[PDB]
């Protein structure tokens, strides 16, 4: 039996509204170490890796390593039934067909125990190796979301150029051209908004904006987004969780001529 | 060169000159009516129609294109049709849609009527919707044609190019000026052949042109093709050329001769194979029946010809009611064998 009680319930909610539009159905790999989720977009262009460590869950109990396929749309539809203050308890039997989610209101007698129906998913874990990226840009999440949502109005392809002095996003569409250059920030009081660009070689890649806008749906997860990027490897948009794990999005570059 | 010497102006026609002057007077006066032009195949209905269009609109009626429209049946069986169109007319054959000929008429007439509302100013205030092969429209489609012909009378005129109007509803015959294009005489065919060869600069003699005319059987296109085909093989033109005939004429003739030769089921099976080879090449069953019946009547007795003629008429009639033509063709053959053997033996 796998039972995981999480007091910070909202996290789950947010995560599922972060994936439910990029991924349609995923395979939660539960183990005594935590919860992992590696899942490729249906068009084989974007990959997502979620990790929630067992030390972040208020109570964690996994006996045998489960691998439960869920329909992330159905899971989001179930989790939308929980208030932002609820204590969420996932529970699943040895090899059950259903996953019981118990939302307990914090200070009431209202306890709502739903029972989602798992699906059959035969996915293979892609092997992503630990890399040392050329350009790592740690910026505020809202900043990146604004950048992507703005450039989506101009054109449907963002050219990211990570030079020495600062990163520069660019786009060109039938109504004109635009480019947001983003300079590194100084050692000024607030820490979260301090842009931090650590580069080794000036890289330049071209990515699709549809998937970047799918990525930015996880901005409420954390305030700082980390863009790792090297030549001819997928962009790595990483959002930390509140000391529970992380959520990384790999986006593959456009075809260069 | 069949398409290389066909005239393009009503004053340039080779035969039926009084009718040509009449048609010119018609297009000259106002309010061009709905025309129903008919007459045996290969007599010049399309030539006269194209000349009428050249007299009606400018010469821009020759710079045409080929549009491919899709129609939807009262179910999901989608059908695709071919409309040859110009800047002032549209020639569609609303019969390839086998039994969905009622919707193509409505939709095409509607589309042409609405396109004429987009600044038709060249010389006339209407367009022409030339429907070829009208006598094969279903009655439910001819009724729609009747309705949508008046519904959009003011903006588009119709020219129905059929032959042997016998299967055209009187409601239509009463709303179209009947232009009748007879088959040109033997002498007219001879004169147009001599004219074509002289413009070609050839030596077409006076005894070969007459053989071409008598073999063409008042069909001008057949005569022109035979003249062109006796040149691709033996340019010098003598009095006794072996003027060729199309492949299927020969096949249908040898099939009839085979039916006449033997009267055994082992022969009837080979005749079934021949009828399949004929049907597969998409030649109409009525043509098969008429061509078989002729060569058969050439090999019967005067007392038997009546029964055979009535048998062919009966079977052909029934074939126009069923779906699989090979059934009725083979039945006709089997019946003729059973009759001819009993006649010859006895």
């Amino acid at each position: 039996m796998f039972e995981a009680r999480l007091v910070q319930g909202s996290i789950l909610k947010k995560v599922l509204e972060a994936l439910k539009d990029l991924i349609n159905e995923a395979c939660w790999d539960i183990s005594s170490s935590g919860v992992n989720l590696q899942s490729m977009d249906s068009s084989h262009v974007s990959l997502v890796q979620l990790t929630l460590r067992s030390e972040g869950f208020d109570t964690y109990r996994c006996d045998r390593n489960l691998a439960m396929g869920v329909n992330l749309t159905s899971m989001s539809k179930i989790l939308k039934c929980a208030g932002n203050e609820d204590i969420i308890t996932l529970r699943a039997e040895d090899n059950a067909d259903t996953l019981a989610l118990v939302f307990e209101a914090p200070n009431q007698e209202k306890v709502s125990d739903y029972e989602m129906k798992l699906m059959d998913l035969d996915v293979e874990q892609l092997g992503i190796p630990e890399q040392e990226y050329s350009c790592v840009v740690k910026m505020p999440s809202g900043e990146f979301a604004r950048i992507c949502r703005d450039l989506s109005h101009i054109g449907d392809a963002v050219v990211i150029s990570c030079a020495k002095d600062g990163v520069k996003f660019s786009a060109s569409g039938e109504l004109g051209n635009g480019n947001i250059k983003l300079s590194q920030t100084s050692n000024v009081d607030k820490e979260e908004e301090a842009v931090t660009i650590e580069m080794n070689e000036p890289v330049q890649l071209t990515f699709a904006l549809r998937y970047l806008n799918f990525f930015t749906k996880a901005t409420p997860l954390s305030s700082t987004v980390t863009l790792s990027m090297s030549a001819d490897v997928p962009l790595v948009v990483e959002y930390k969780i509140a000391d529970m794990g992380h959520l990384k999005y790999y986006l593959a570059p456009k075809i260069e001529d | 060169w069949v398409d290389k010497y066909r005239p393009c102006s009503l004053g340039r026609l080779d035969y039926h000159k009084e009718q040509a002057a009449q048609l010119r007077n018609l297009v000259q006066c106002g309010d061009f009516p709905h025309l129903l032009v008919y007459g045996p195949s290969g007599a010049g209905k399309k030539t006269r129609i194209m000349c009428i269009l050249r007299e009606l609109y400018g010469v821009g009626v020759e710079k045409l294109r080929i549009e491919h429209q899709t129609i939807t049946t009262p179910s999901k069986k989608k059908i695709e049709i071919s409309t040859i169109a110009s800047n002032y007319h549209l020639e569609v054959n609303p019969s390839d849609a086998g039994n969905s000929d009622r919707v193509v008429i409505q939709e095409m007439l509607k589309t042409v009527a609405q396109s004429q509302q987009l600044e038709t100013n060249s010389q006339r205030d209407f367009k022409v919707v030339l429907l070829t092969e009208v006598d094969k429209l279903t009655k439910d489609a001819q009724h729609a044609l009747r309705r949508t012909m008046e519904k959009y009378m003011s903006t588009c005129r119709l020219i129905l190019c059929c032959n042997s109007t016998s299967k055209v509803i009187p409601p239509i015959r009463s709303r179209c000026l009947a232009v009748r294009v007879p088959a040109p005489s033997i002498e007219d065919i001879c004169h147009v052949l001599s004219t074509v060869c002289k413009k070609e600069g050839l030596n077409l003699p006076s005894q070969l042109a007459h053989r071409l005319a008598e073999k063409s059987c008042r069909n001008l296109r057949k005569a022109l093709l035979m003249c062109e085909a006796c040149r691709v093989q033996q340019y010098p033109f003598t009095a006794d050329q072996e003027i060729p005939e199309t492949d299927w004429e020969v096949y249908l003739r040898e099939t009839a001769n085979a039916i006449v030769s033997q009267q055994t089921p082992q022969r009837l099976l080979e005749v079934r194979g021949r009828l399949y080879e004929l049907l597969t090449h998409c030649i109409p069953p009525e043509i098969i029946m008429k061509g078989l019946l002729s060569e058969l009547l050439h090999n019967c007795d005067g007392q038997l010809k009546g029964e055979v003629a009535q048998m062919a008429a009966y079977y052909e009639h029934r074939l126009q009611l069923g779906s699989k033509a090979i059934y009725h063709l083979e039945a006709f053959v089997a019946k003729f064998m059973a009759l001819y053997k009993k006649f010859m033996e006895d």
Partner: protein, 448 residues
């Protein structure tokens, strides 16, 4: 141990040398393999296309062919079935940004291989209001792509697909010959421990119309009936017998013989009634011919009833048809079948007629200078004279075949495909085309 898998999945073609249909030099699977292997040179004479269109009858191996081809070359494909919505908006929001993009399977593999391709299966299912504007956006994607799109259809002669074939390398799967499927299914039935007489195997393969999936499902049901311890050919042979059905059959039974497979029984009877020798007509050919004519009359009456039932769905005339097309001829031809109840062979002739029809219609539409007749013999005689026009220059002089072929091909707006169509279209009686009756044809395809 119980099996949780069908035969259609136990004995699927796990490799490429196992596709029963095509293992030849230039077949639908090797042509596609060679078009894919050197697709990079695009961005057979099909190296100029950006997409393939595998089309043909059901159950022949199109899906398996495309999957195994994309799998042998290390490609990685994204299949889009008909159970996936593919309207214009959905299509250009799902697969638009993936065509000119790199696949993440190209970096992270569990070896690593680039060359991502797309597979658009069941492209003729993109019909109806749900998939509104699918084919238009699909050709708009094919026009601007950077990865090989492999579209699969089911009937190339479709209105929506006719606007798509102009952009796709056109492959066409043939129904596999009966001997190939026979060898394969005999090997399979041997693996399974099921013994079936080869005649019954030929019967099963023919009744299923050489549909390998259907013959596999039929073998499964056969083995099921075997473990439990009347086909079309059998009933078609039981209607023209004499000696055993004297008291065994009545009008109800003879009328029921039609109802076993009432959709195909009349065709079987019309095909096999001619190989019978009426016991009533004891060798007297004058009576045997008369019985044949009477049976033919009855079969035409059955055809009339059939054409009447088809139009308005009036299933109350089924007994009348059973009387005209199956019982009557029986009593008229009640002798002894000679050889075998051969297949009706009318469906193939109707399909070939539809092919010749559309071929002639296309060739005639290109000759729309100032003359046209949709599909009549008017065009069959223009096109016979065009075939004798074309072949003449080359028959008589090798040096003028090119000049005249081009002059005519461009005077009437014709192409090389049109040439091939006009050549083996007017071959009556299996007569060889006057173009194979040598050295100039090689330079003829290369210089055109």
């Amino acid at each position: 141990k119980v099996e949780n898998l069908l035969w259609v999945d136990k004995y699927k073609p796990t490799s490429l040398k196992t596709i029963i249909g095509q293992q030849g030099d230039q077949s639908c699977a090797n042509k596609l393999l060679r078009w894919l292997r050197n697709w990079q040179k695009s961005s057979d004479d099909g190296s100029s296309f950006k997409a393939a269109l595998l089309s043909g009858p059901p159950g022949v191996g199109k899906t398996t062919t495309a999957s195994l081809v994309c799998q042998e070359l290390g490609y990685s494909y994204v299949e889009l079935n008909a159970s996936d919505t593919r309207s214009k908006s959905s299509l250009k929001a799902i697969v638009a940004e993936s065509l000119n993009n790199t696949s993440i399977k190209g970096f992270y593999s569990n070896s690593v291989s680039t060359k991502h391709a797309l597979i658009m299966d069941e492209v003729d299912g993109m019909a109806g209001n749900e998939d509104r504007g699918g084919i238009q956006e699909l050709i708009g994607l094919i026009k601007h792509t950077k990865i090989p799109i492999i579209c699969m259809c089911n009937d190339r002669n479709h209105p929506k697909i006719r606007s798509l074939v102009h952009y796709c390398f056109d492959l066409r799967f043939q129904r596999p010959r009966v001997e190939q499927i026979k060898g394969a299914m005999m090997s399979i039935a041997f693996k399974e421990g099921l013994k079936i007489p080869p005649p019954a195997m030929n019967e099963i393969i023919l009744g299923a119309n050489q549909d390998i999936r259907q013959v596999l499902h039929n073998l499964s049901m056969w083995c099921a009936r075997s473990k439990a311890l009347m086909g079309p050919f059998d009933v078609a042979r039981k209607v023209f017998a004499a000696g055993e059905e004297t008291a065994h059959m009545s009008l109800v039974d003879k009328s029921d013989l039609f109802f076993h497979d009432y959709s195909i029984a009349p065709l079987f009877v019309q095909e096999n009634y001619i190989h019978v020798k009426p016991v009533a007509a004891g060798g007297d050919m004058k009576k045997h011919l008369m019985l044949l004519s009477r049976a033919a009359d009855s079969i035409c009456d059955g055809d009339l009833v059939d054409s009447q039932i088809r139009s308005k769905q009036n299933w109350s005339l089924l007994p009348a048809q059973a009387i005209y097309a199956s019982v009557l001829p029986g009593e008229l031809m009640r002798g002894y079948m000679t050889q075998f109840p051969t297949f009706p062979s009318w469906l193939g002739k109707h399909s070939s007629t539809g092919k010749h029809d559309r071929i002639v219609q296309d060739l005639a539409l290109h000759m729309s200078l100032r003359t046209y007749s949709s599909k009549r013999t008017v065009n069959m005689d223009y096109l016979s004279l065009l075939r004798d026009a074309l072949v003449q220059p080359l028959t008589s002089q090798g040096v003028d075949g090119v000049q005249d072929v081009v002059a005519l091909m461009d005077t009437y707006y014709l192409m090389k495909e049109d040439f091939e169509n006009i050549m083996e279209i007017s071959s009556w009686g299996g007569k060889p085309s006057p173009f194979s009756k040598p050295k100039v044809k090689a330079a003829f395809t290369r210089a055109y």
